[PDB]
Amino acid sequence: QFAKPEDAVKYRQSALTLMASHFGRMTPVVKGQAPYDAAQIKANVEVLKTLSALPWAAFGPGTEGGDARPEIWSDAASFKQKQQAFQDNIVKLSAAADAGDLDKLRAAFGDVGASCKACHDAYRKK
């Protein structure tokens, strides 16, 4: 859907920005600094699930750019593995949110966070 590689870069950065907000906004709830409203968390995680599928299609062949390391393309099986793992952790977060349990949510939120750090260490320029 991108007329130029620059557009793919803008798209994935924008998707990632939105994901960061939707993930990050739950941190005070997970730490107990803000109240836990099960229906609010369920809705937000549903948004996060939608968003979390979107960036990966914008790292297609020939969309080198931004802070993406070339390793994303020269090691494509491994990158696909990492995004698929991350999306699996999101499914677990969605399951915790649907169940309405704050202990399961905290655990699942940590797994998501570690999936994020893992990928960045490997595939994002510092």
- Is residue 15 within the footprint of a second copy (CB under 8 A)? yes
In the block, residue with structure tokens 């994935």: 12
**Is the CB of 19 or the CB of 108 nearer to a second copy?**
19
Does position 112 interact with a second copy (CB under 8 A)? The reply is no
Q: Which of 5, 10, 94, 116 binds a second copy (CB under 8 A)?
A: 10
Is 52 in contact with 74 (CB distance < 8 Å)? no
Task: Name which position in 11, 23, 41, 105 contacts ligand HEC (CB under 6 A).
Answer: 23
Q: Interface with ligand HEC includes 68 (CB under 6 A)? A: yes
Q: Which stretch binds ligand HEC (CB under 6 A): 27-35, 37-45, 61-69, 101-109?
A: 61-69
Q: Is 38 in the site for ligand HEC (CB under 6 A)?
A: no
Q: H-type helices in 1-126, by residue range?
A: 5-24, 27-31, 38-52, 71-74, 76-99, 102-123
Question: How many other CB atoms sit within 10 Å of the CB of residue 22?
Answer: 18
Query: 68: which strand partners?
Result: 124
